[PDB]
PDB file of N, CA and C in Angstrom:
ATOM      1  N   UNK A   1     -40.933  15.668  34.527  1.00 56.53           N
ATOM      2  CA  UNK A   1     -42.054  15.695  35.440  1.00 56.53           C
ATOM      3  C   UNK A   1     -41.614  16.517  36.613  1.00 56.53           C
ATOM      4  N   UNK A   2     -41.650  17.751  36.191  1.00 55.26           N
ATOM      5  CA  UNK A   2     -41.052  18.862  37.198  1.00 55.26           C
ATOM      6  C   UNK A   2     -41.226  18.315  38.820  1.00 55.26           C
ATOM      7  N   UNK A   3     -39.868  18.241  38.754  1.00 52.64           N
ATOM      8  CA  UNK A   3     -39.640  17.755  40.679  1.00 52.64           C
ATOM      9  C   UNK A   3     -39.118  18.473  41.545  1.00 52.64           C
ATOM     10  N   UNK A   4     -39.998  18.975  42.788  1.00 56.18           N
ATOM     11  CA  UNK A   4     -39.479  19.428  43.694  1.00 56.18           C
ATOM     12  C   UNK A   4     -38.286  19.087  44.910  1.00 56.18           C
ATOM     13  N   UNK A   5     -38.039  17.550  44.476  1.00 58.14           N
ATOM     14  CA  UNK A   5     -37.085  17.027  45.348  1.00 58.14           C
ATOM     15  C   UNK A   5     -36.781  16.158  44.245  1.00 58.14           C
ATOM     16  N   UNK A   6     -35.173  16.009  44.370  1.00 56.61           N
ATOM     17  CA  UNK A   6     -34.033  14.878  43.438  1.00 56.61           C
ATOM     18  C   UNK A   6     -33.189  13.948  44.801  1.00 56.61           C
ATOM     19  N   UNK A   7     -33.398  12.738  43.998  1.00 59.19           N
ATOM     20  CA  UNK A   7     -32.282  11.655  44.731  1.00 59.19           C
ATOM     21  C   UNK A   7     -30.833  11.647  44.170  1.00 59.19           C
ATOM     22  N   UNK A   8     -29.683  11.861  44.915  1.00 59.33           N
ATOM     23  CA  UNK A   8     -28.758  12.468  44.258  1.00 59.33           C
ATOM     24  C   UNK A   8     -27.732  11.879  44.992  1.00 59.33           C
ATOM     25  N   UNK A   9     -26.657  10.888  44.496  1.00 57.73           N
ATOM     26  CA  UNK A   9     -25.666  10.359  45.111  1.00 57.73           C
ATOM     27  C   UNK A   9     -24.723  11.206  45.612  1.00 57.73           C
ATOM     28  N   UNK A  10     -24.409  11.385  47.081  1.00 56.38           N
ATOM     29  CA  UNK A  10     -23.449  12.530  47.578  1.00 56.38           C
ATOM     30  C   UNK A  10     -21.819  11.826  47.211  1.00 56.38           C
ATOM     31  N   UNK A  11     -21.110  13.513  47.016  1.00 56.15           N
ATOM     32  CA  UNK A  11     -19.901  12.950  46.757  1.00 56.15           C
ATOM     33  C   UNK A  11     -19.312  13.246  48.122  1.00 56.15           C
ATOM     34  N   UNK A  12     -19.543  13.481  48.949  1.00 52.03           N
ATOM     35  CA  UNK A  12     -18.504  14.255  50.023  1.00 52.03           C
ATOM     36  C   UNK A  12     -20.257  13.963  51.303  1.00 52.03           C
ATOM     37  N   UNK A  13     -19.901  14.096  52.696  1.00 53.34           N
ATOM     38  CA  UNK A  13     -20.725  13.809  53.956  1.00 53.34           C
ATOM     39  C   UNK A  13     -20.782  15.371  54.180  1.00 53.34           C
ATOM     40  N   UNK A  14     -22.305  15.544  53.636  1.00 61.94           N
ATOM     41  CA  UNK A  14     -23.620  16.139  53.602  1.00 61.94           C
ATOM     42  C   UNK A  14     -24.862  16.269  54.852  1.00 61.94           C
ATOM     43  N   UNK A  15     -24.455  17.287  55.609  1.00 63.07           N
ATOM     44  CA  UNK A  15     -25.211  17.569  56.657  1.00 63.07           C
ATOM     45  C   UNK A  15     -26.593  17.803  56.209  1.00 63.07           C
ATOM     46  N   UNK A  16     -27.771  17.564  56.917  1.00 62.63           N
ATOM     47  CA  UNK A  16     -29.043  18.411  57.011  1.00 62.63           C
ATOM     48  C   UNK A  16     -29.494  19.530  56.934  1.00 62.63           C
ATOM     49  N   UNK A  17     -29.976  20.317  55.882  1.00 61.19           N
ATOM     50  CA  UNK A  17     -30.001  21.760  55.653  1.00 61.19           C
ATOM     51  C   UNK A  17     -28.729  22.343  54.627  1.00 61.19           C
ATOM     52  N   UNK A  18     -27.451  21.535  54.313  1.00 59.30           N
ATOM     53  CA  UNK A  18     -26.710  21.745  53.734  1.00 59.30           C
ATOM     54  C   UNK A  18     -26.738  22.004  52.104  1.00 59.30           C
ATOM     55  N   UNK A  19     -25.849  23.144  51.914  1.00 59.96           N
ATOM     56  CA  UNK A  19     -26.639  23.911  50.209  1.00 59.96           C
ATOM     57  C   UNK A  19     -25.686  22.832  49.395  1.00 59.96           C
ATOM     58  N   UNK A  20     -26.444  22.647  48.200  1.00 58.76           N
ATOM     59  CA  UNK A  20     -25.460  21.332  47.434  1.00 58.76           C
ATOM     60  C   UNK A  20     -25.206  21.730  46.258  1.00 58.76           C
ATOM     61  N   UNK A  21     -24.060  21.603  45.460  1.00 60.22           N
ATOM     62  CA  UNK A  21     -23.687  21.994  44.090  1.00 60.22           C
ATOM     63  C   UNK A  21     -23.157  21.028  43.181  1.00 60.22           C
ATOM     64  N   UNK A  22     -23.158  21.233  42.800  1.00 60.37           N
ATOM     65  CA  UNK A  22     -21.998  19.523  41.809  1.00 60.37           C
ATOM     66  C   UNK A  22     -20.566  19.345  42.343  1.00 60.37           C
ATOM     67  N   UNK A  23     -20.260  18.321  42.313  1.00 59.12           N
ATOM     68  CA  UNK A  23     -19.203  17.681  43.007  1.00 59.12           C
ATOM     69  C   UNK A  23     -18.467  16.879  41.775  1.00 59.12           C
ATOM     70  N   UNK A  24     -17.594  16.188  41.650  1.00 61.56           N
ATOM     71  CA  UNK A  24     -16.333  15.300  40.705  1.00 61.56           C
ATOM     72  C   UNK A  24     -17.463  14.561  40.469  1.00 61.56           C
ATOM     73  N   UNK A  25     -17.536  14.403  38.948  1.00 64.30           N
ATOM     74  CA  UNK A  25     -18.092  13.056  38.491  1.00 64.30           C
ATOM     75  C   UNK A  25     -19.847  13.298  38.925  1.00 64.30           C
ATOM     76  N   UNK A  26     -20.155  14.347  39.024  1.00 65.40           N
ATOM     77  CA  UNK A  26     -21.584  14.411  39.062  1.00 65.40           C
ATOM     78  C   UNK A  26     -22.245  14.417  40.361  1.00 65.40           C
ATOM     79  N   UNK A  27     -21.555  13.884  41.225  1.00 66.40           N
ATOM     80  CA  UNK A  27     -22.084  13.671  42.635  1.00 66.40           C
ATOM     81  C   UNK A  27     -21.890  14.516  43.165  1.00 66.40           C
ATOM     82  N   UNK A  28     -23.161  14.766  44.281  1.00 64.70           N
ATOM     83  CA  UNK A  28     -23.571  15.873  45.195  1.00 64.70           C
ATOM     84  C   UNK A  28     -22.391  16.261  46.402  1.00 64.70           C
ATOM     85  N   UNK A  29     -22.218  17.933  46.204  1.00 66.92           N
ATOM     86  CA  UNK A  29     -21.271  18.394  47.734  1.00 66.92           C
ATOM     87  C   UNK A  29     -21.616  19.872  48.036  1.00 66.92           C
ATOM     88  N   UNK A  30     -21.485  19.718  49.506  1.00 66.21           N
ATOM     89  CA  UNK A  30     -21.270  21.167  50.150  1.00 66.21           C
ATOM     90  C   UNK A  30     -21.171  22.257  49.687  1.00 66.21           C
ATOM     91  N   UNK A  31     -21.881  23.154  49.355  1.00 66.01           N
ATOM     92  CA  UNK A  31     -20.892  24.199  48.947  1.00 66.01           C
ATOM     93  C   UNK A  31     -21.479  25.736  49.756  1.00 66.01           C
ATOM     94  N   UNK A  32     -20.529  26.610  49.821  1.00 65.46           N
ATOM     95  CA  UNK A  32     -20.587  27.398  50.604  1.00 65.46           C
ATOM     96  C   UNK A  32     -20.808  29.195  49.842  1.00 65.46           C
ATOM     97  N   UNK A  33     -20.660  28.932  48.387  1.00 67.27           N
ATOM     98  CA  UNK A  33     -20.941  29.803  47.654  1.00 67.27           C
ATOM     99  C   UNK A  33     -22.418  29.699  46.669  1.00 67.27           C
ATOM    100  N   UNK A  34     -23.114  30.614  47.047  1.00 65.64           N
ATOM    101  CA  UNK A  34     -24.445  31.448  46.186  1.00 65.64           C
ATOM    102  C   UNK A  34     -23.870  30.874  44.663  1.00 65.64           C
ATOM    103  N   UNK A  35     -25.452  30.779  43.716  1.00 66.52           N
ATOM    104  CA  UNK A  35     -25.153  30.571  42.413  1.00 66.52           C
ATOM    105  C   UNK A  35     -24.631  29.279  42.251  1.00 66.52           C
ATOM    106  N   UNK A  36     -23.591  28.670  43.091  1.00 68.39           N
ATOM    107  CA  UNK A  36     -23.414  26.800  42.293  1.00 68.39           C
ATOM    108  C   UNK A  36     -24.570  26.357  43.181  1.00 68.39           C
ATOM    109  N   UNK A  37     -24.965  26.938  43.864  1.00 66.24           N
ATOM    110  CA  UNK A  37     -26.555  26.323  44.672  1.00 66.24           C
ATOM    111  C   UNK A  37     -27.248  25.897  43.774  1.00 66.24           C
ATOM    112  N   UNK A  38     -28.225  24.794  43.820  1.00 66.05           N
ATOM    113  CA  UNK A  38     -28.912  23.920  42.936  1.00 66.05           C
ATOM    114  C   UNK A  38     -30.011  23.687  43.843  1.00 66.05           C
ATOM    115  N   UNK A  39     -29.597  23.111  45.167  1.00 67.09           N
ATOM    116  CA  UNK A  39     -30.567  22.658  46.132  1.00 67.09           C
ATOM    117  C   UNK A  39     -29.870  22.841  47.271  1.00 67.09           C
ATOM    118  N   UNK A  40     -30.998  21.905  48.476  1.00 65.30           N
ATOM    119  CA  UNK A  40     -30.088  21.804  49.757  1.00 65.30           C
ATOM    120  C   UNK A  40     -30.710  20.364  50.268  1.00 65.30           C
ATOM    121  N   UNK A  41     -29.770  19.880  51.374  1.00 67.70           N
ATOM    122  CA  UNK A  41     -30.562  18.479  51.801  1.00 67.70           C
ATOM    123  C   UNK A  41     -31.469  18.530  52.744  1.00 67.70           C
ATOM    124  N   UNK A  42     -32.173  17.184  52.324  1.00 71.12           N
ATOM    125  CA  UNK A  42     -32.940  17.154  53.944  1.00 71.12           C
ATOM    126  C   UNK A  42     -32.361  16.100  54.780  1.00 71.12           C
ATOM    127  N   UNK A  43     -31.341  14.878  54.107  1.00 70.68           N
ATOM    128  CA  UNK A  43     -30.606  14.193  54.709  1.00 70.68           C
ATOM    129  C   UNK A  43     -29.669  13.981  55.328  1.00 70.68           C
ATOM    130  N   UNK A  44     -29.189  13.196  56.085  1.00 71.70           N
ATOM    131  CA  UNK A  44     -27.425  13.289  56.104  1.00 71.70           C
ATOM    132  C   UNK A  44     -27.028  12.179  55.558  1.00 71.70           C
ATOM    133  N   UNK A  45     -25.843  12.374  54.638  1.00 70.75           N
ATOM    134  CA  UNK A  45     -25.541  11.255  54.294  1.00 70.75           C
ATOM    135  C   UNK A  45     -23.330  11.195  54.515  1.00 70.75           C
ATOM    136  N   UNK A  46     -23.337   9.925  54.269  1.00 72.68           N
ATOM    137  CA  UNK A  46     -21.899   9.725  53.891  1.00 72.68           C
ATOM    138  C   UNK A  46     -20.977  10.062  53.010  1.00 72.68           C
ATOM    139  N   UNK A  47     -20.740   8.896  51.962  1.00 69.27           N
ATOM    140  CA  UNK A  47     -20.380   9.385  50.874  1.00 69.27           C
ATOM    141  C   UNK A  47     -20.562   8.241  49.981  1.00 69.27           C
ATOM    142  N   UNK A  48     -21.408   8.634  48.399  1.00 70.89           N
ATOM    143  CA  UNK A  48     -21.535   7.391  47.817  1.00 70.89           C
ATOM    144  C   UNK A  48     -22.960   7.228  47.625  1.00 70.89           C
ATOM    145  N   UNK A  49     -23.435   7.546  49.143  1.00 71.81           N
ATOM    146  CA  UNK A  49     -24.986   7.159  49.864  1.00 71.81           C
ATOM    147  C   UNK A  49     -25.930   8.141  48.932  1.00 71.81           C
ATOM    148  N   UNK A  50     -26.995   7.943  48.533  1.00 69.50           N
ATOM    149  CA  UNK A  50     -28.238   8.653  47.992  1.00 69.50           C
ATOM    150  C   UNK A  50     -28.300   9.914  48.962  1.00 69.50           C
ATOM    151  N   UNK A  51     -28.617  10.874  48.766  1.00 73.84           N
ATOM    152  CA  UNK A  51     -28.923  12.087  49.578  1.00 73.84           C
ATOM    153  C   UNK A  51     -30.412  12.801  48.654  1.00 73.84           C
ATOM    154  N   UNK A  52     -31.176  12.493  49.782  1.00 76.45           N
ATOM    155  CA  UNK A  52     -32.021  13.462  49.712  1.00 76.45           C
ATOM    156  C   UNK A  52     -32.294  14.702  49.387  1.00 76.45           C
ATOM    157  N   UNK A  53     -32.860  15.977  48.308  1.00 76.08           N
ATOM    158  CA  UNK A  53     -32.700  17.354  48.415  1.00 76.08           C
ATOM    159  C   UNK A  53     -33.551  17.761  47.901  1.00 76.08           C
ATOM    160  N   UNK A  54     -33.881  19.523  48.186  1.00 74.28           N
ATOM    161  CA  UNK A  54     -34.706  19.597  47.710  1.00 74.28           C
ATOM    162  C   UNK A  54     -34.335  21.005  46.688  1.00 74.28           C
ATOM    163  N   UNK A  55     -34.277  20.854  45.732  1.00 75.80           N
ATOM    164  CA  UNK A  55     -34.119  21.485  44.795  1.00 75.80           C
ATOM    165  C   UNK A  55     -34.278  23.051  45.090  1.00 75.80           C
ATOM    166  N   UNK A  56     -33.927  24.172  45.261  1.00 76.65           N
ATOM    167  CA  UNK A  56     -33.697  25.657  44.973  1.00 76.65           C
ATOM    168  C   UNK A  56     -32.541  26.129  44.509  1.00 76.65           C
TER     169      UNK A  56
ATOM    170  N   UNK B   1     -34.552  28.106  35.733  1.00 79.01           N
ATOM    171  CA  UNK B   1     -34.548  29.593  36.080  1.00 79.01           C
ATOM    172  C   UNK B   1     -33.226  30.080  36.235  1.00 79.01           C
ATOM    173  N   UNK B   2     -32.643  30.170  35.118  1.00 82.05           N
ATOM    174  CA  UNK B   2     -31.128  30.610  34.989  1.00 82.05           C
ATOM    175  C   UNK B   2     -30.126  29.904  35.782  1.00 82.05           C
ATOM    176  N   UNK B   3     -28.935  30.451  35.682  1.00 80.25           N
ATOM    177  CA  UNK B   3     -27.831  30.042  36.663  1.00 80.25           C
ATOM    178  C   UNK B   3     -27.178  31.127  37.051  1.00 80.25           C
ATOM    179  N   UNK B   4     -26.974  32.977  36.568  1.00 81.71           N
ATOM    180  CA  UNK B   4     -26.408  33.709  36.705  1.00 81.71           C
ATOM    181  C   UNK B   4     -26.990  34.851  37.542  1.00 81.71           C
ATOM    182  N   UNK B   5     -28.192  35.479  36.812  1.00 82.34           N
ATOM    183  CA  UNK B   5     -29.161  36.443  37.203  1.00 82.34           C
ATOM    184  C   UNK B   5     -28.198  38.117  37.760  1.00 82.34           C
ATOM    185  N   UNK B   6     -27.462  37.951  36.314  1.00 81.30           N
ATOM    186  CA  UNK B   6     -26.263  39.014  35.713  1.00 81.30           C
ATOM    187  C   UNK B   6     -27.379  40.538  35.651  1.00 81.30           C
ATOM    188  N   UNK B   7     -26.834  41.206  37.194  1.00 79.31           N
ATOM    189  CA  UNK B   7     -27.539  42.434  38.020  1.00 79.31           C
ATOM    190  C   UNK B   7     -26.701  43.235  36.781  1.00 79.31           C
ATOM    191  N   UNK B   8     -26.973  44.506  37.084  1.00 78.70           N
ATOM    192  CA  UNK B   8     -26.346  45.984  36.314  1.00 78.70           C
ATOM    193  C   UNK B   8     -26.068  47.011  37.467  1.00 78.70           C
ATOM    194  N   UNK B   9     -25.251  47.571  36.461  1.00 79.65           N
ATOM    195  CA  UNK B   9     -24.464  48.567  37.217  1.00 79.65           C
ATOM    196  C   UNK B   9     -25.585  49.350  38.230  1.00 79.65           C
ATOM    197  N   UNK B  10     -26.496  49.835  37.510  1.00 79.96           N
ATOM    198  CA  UNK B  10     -27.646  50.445  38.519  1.00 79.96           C
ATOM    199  C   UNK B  10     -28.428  49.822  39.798  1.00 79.96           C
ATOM    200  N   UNK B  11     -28.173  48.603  39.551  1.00 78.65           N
ATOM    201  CA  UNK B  11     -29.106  47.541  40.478  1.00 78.65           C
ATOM    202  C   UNK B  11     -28.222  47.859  42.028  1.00 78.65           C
ATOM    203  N   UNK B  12     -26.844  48.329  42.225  1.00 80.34           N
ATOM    204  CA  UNK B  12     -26.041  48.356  43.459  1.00 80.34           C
ATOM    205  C   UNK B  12     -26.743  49.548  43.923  1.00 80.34           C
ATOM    206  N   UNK B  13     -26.946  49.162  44.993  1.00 80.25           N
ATOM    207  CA  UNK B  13     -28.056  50.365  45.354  1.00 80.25           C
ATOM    208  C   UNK B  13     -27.218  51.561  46.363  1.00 80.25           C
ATOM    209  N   UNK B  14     -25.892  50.900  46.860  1.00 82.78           N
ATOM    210  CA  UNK B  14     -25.705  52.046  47.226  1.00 82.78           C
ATOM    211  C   UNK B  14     -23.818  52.285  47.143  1.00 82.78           C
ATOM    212  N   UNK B  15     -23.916  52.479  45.568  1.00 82.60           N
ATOM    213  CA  UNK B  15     -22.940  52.818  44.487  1.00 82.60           C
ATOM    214  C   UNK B  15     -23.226  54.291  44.607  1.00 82.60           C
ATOM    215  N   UNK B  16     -22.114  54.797  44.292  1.00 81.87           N
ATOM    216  CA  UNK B  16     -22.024  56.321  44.174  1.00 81.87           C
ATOM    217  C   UNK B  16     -21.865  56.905  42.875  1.00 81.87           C
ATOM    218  N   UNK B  17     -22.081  57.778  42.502  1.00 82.15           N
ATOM    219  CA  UNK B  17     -22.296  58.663  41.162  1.00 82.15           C
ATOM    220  C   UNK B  17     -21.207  58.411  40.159  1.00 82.15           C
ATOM    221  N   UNK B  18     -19.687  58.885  40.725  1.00 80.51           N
ATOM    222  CA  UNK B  18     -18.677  58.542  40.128  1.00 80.51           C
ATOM    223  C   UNK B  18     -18.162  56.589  40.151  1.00 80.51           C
ATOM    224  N   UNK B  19     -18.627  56.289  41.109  1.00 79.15           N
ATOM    225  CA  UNK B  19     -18.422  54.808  41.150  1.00 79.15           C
ATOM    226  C   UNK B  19     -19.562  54.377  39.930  1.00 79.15           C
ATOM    227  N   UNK B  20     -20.258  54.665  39.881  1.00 77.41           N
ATOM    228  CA  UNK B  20     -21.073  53.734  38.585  1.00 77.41           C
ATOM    229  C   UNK B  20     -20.243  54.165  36.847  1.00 77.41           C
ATOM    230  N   UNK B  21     -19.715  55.244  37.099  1.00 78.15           N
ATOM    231  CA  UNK B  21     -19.425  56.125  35.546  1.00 78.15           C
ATOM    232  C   UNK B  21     -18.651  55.355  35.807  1.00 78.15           C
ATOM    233  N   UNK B  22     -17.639  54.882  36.684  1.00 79.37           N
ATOM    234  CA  UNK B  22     -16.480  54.346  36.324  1.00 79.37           C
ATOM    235  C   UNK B  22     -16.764  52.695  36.431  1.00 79.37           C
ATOM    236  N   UNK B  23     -17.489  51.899  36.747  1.00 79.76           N
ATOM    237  CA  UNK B  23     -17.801  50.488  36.745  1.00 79.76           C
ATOM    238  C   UNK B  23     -17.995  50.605  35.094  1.00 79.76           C
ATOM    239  N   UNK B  24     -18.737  51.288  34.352  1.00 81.00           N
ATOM    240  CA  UNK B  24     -19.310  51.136  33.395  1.00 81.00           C
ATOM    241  C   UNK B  24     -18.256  51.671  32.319  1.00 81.00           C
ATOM    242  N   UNK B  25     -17.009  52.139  32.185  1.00 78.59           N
ATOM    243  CA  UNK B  25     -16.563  52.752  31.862  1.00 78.59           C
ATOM    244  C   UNK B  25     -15.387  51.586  31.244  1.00 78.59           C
ATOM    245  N   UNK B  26     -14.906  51.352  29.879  1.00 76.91           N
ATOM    246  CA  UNK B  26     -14.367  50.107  29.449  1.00 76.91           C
ATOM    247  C   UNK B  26     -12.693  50.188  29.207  1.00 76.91           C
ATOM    248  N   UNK B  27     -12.124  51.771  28.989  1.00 80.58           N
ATOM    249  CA  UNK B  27     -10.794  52.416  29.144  1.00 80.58           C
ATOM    250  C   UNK B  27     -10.101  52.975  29.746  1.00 80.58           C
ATOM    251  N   UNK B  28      -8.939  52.886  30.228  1.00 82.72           N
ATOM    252  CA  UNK B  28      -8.268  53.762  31.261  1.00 82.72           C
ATOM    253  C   UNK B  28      -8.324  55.139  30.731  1.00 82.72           C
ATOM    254  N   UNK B  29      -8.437  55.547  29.078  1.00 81.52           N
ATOM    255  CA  UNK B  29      -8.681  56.725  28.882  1.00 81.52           C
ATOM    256  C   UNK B  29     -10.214  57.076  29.385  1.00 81.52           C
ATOM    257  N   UNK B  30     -11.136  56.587  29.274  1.00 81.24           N
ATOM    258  CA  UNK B  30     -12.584  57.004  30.008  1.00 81.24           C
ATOM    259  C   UNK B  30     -12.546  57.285  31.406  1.00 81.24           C
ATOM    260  N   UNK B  31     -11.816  55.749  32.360  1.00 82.63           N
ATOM    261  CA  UNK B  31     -11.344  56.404  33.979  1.00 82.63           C
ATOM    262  C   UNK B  31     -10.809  57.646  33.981  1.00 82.63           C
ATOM    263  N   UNK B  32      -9.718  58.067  33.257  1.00 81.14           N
ATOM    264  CA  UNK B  32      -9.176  59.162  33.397  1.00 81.14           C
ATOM    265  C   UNK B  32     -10.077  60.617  33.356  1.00 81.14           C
ATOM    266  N   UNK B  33     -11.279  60.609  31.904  1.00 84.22           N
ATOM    267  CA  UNK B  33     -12.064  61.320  31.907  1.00 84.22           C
ATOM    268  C   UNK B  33     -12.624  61.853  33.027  1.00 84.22           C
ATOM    269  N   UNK B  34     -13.164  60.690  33.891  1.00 80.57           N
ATOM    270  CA  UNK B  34     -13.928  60.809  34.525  1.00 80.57           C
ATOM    271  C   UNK B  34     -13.036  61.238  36.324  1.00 80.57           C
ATOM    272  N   UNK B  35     -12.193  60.858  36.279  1.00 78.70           N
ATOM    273  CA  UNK B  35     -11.566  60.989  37.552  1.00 78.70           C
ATOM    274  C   UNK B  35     -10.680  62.334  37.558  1.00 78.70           C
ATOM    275  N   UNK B  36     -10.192  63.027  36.707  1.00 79.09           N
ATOM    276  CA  UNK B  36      -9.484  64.276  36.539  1.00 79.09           C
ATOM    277  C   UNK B  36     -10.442  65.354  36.202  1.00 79.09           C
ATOM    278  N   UNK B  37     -10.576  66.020  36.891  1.00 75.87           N
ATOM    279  CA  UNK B  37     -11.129  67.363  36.539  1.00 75.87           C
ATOM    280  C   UNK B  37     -10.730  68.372  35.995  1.00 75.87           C
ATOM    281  N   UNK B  38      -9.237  68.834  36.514  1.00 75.44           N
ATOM    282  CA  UNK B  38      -8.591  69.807  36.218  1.00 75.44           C
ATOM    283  C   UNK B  38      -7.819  69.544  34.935  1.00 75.44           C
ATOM    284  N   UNK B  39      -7.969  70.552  33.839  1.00 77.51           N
ATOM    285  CA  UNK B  39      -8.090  69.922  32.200  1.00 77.51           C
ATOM    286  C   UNK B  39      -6.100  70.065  31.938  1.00 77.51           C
ATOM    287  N   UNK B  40      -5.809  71.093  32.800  1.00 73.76           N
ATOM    288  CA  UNK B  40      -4.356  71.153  32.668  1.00 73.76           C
ATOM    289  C   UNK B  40      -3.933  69.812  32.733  1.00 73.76           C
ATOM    290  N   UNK B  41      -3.708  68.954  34.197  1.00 77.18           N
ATOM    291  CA  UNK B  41      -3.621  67.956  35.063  1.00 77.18           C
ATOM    292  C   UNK B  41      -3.892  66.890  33.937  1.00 77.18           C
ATOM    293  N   UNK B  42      -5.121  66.881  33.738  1.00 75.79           N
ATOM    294  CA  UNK B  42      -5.667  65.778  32.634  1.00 75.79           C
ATOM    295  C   UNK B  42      -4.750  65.425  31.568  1.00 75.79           C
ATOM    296  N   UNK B  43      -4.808  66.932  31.063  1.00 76.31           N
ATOM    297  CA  UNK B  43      -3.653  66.620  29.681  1.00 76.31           C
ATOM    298  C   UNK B  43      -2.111  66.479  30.073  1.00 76.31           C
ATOM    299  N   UNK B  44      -1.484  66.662  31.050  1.00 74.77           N
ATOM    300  CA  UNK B  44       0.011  66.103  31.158  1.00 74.77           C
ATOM    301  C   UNK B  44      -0.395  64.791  31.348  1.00 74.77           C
ATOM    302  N   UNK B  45      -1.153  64.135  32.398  1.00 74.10           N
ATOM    303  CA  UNK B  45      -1.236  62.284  32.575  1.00 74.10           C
ATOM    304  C   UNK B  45      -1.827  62.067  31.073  1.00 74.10           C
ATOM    305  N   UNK B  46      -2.406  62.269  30.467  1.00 73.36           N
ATOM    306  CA  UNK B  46      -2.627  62.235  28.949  1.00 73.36           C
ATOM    307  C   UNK B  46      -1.195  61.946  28.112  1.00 73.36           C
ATOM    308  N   UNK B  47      -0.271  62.818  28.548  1.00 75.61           N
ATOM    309  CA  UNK B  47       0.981  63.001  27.638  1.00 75.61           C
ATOM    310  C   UNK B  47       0.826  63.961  26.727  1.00 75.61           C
ATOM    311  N   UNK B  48       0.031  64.745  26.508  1.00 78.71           N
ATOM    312  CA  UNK B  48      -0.995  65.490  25.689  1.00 78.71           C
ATOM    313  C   UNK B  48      -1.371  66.848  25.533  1.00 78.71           C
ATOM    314  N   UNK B  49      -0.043  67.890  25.920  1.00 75.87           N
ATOM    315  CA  UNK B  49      -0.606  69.371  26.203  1.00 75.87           C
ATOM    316  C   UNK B  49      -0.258  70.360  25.106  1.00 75.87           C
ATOM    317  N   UNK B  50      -0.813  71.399  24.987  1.00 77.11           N
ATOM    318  CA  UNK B  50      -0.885  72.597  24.119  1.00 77.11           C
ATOM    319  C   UNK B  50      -0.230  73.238  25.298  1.00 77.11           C
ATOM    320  N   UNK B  51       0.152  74.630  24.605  1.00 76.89           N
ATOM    321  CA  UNK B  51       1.029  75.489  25.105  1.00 76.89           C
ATOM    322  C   UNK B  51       0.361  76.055  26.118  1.00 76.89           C
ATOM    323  N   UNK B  52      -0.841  76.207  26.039  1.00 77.10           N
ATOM    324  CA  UNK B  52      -1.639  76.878  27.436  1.00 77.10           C
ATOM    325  C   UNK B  52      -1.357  76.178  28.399  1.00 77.10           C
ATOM    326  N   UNK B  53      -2.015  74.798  28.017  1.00 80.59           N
ATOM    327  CA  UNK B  53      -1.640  72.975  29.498  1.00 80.59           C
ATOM    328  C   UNK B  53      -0.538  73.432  29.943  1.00 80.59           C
ATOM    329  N   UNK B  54       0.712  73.940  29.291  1.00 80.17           N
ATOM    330  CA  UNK B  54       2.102  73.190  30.231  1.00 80.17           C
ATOM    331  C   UNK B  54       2.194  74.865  30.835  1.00 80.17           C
ATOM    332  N   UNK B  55       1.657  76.221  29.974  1.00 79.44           N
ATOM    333  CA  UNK B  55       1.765  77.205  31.069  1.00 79.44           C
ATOM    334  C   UNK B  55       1.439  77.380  32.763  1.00 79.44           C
ATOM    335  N   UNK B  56      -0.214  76.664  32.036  1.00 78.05           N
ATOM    336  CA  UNK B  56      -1.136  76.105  33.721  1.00 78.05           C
ATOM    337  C   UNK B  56      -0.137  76.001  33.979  1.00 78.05           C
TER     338      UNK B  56
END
């Protein structure tokens, strides 16, 4: 059911606006390189914590 | 919508004439083609001369 936003357990503390790629074990992280981009957040989260994103 | 979006040699827009022959180019014998002009020259880095080559 094509979604414009995924709930996505962060692996690593995930700023607002931050581009997200896969992280160890599936969970969401930082990343600073084009192409592992998947999405970006609209949350901040910790680590562990659900993070908000929105998929590009 | 993919994960790569694998551009071509032509897509660098501001690649130069000999820079694309040689991106595209799969042998150090083809670099060589393309980077030596002078056919004497060519054929000694070749290893490769007739009696005219080694007069040059």
């Amino acid at each position: 059911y094509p979604l414009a936003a995924w709930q996505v357990i962060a692996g690593s503390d995930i700023k607002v606006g931050d581009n997200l790629t896969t992280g160890k074990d599936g969970t969401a992280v930082p990343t600073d390189d084009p192409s592992t981009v998947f999405g970006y957040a609209v949350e901040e989260a910790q680590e562990g914590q659900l993070v908000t994103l929105v998929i590009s | 919508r993919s994960k790569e979006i694998s551009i071509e040699v032509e897509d660098i827009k501001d690649a130069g004439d000999t820079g694309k022959r040689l991106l595209k180019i799969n042998t150090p014998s083809g670099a060589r083609n393309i980077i030596i002009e002078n056919e004497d020259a060519k054929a000694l880095i070749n290893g490769e001369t007739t009696n005219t080559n080694k007069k040059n």
